[PDB]
From a paper:
The Omicron variant and its sublineages have spike glycoproteins that are highly diverged from the pandemic founder and first-generation vaccine strain, resulting in significant evasion from monoclonal antibody therapeutics and vaccines. Here, we describe several potently neutralizing IGHV3-53-using antibodies targeting the RBM, capable of Omicron cross-neutralization, extending to BA.2 and even BA.4/BA.5 sublineages. Here, we demonstrate that a common class of public antibodies can develop broad cross-neutralizing activity through affinity maturation.
Furthermore, we determined the high-resolution structure of trimeric Omicron spike in complex with CAB-A17 to define the structural basis for cross-neutralization of Omicron. To define the structural context underpinning the cross-neutralization of Omicron, we resolved the structure of a CAB-A17 Fab in a complex with the Omicron (BA.1) spike. The cryo-EM structure of CAB-A17 in complex with the Omicron spike sheds light on the structural basis of its broad SARS-CoV-2 cross-neutralization.
Numbering used by the authors:
A (entry chain A): 612 to 620, 641 to 675, 691 to 708
B (entry chain B): 709 to 827, 856 to 1147
C (entry chain C): 856 to 952
D (entry chain C): 709 to 806
E (entry chain C): 1002 to 1050
F (entry chain A): 953 to 1001
G (entry chain C): 1100 to 1147
Write the structure that this text describes.
Amino acid sequence: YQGVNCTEVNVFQTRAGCLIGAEYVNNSYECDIPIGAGICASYQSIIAYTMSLGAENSVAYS
Amino acid sequence: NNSIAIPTNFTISVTTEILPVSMTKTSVDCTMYICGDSTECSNLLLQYGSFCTQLKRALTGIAVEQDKNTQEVFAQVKQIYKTPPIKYFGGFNFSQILPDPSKPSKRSPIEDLLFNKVTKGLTVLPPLLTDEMIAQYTSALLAGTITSGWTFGAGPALQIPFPMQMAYRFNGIGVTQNVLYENQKLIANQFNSAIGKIQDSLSSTPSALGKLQDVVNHNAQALNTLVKQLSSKFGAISSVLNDIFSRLDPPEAEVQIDRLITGRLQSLQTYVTQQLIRAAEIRASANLAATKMSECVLGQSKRVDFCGKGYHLMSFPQSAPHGVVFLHVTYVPAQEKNFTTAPAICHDGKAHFPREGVFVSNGTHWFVTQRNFYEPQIITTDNTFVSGNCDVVIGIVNNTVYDPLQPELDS
Amino acid sequence: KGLTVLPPLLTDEMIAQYTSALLAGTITSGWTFGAGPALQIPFPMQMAYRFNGIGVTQNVLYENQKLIANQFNSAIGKIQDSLSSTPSALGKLQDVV
Amino acid sequence: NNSIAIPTNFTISVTTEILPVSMTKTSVDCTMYICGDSTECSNLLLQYGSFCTQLKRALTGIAVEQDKNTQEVFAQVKQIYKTPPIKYFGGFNFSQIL
Amino acid sequence: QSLQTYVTQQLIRAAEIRASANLAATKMSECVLGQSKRVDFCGKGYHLM
Amino acid sequence: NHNAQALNTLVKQLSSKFGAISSVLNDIFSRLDPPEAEVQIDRLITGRL
Amino acid sequence: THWFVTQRNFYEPQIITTDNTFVSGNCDVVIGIVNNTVYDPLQPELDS
Ligand SMILES: *[C@@H]1O[C@H](CO)[C@@H](O)[C@H](O)[C@H]1NC(C)=O
Ligand SMILES: *[C@@H]1O[C@H](CO)[C@@H](O)[C@H](O)[C@H]1NC(C)=O
């Protein structure tokens, strides 16, 4: 629901709006379906996760 | 005919290029805008049918395109590289470009300044990539450029010391490595001064970020016009649908309502068409930004004026709201002097041509120097190639070409 | 009928002056004017640098300078005739009008 | 596998490329175009909407863009350079271009 | 409607002209102001000036 | 796909009444006298255009 | 009958010399290698 607080109307609040029927997961994966505001959904069930931009790497400088 | 100007000094110049990458994503509910809460109008709208769906599809395509545009410009790195904790890079200070830990946003100081400067059934949809995520992509690009040079763009990142990378870039512009190493402290100071000036220049001039502001303003103006058009009667008795229903018999009322519905549909169509044309302009700018990111940030560009004015050395990407700012570091020749020049030197009845330089004369002596910077060197067999005889060449001057072997042979 | 054509801010004469400036710089300063302050260079030497860029040694330009100059002059002469002879070449501009 | 072709002579070719840079700038008086000189229809036009303002804004934007296009292509020189009075350049004749 | 059609067509034509102008500006910098190593950007053959 | 969708949309648009009694022109002509028919036909023509 | 080194875009035959050639590896690895003399500038001066 776009622009609606969850209380107003498996519940998660995102900047885009309330999401129902998807369970938020802390683990991050490459985006499958773009809900918006950095939140993406995939079928694992349906899960909402913050998209992972890339695997972190540390460059070496000497 | 015989005079050449060779620069005896250099200036490191940082120039900022601001390119729009994305535009606000908007969605329209056709029923809400055209009919409000009137059920009767909604039933009448169903006859038109596909027009509303077509408008929605066009807007949806624009929104997905905007997400794609941001991805193309920024998501050129498959891993998020992290700058090493030690921040010494050959006397070059990258504090302004690099991210600041203290800030909650983690944006760079220049990015923070840019962020601050930029300021009915219609809804604005949030961008998929958050500003923090875009900043993280930018940080990865900066870390790669500073630590691995251009290798990260063309393959896995390969570590190189930053002064050495700068020396390679000097070779790209035709200046020898020695110039960078000999004058490293000066070059570092010039670079640092330029970055500080950049922060002041962007802050001082409002029009500097004008292109981004223009995109935001145009979208706002279009939405405002659309909202205003609701008031317009369009030749109907009254703008309000309920007033028409209340004051007129049902057949006549239907005709008047039809006039309002058609006018409102025309207004939405005009908005959608204008947005499509604007989206095409933004897409062209986004493609240009992606090309600049690859050619300038991820490599040294031999194209003239593509990455700043002057001989391009390196470029740094900075995220800005709905846009990308490129800081272009360029080599600018300075302090030119005039020297007599000859195409070839005639020694031993043979014509000698500079292998990678221009023959120049102080007045009594002849030297071979690199074109970009004045570094006079004795004419020798090593720095010259012999082709033909003196007669064919025009303007050839007689002078001695030293041989390195001859002194050793004499000894 | 309410349809009006607004004059361009830059007059044709002013555009010609800009073009003349570009030509003067290129002939006398080579490519330096684009990358910075104009730096004087003899035109034959500038051409020699350009030959080096395309991968041909500068000796070729100096040794064959008269031939190259004659060929360039002939080509420039041909262009005026070609443009006048064929309307299609200027067709794109005409299409806009 | 063992054969290569190497050019033994060269030809200098001058070719012409034509690119449009600007288009005619136009402005429309909405009232004159639709209503002519009739006052009554002008009032009716007022009732239809604010479309005329939108049209004027779009056309004005095109006009400004055309001036910007010319500036971008031609105004790339900080100073107006003047050709040397003696036009001798190694046997190259630039008379037609100059 | 006729006026609206004219404006829309002019906007599309303007976009095409703008693209051509951008190409012209790019050529002016790449070809007039420097030697271009890109193939066929500034004429057939190896670009000189 | 985009080309196919656009053509399908136009065919679909033919169904729309546009405030007329019927989408079919022949029905309008058969059931109405020339003055009323002209108004209804005008609405259809404008929408299709 | 003779082998020369030339610029790719124009034909300017030059005697193969150490100055215009760089030595890497041994003959066996390369395919299509041919045997010809490579002149050394130092040797005539040394002989004198
Ligand atoms: C260049 O012009 C000068 C006179 O200004 C003349 O003396 C000289 O011979 C000319 N050089 C060439 C190569 O023609
Ligand atoms: C070249 O091709 C010929 C056949 O046309 C073959 O006999 C010869 O061995 C080949 N040489 C090389 C070096 O591959």
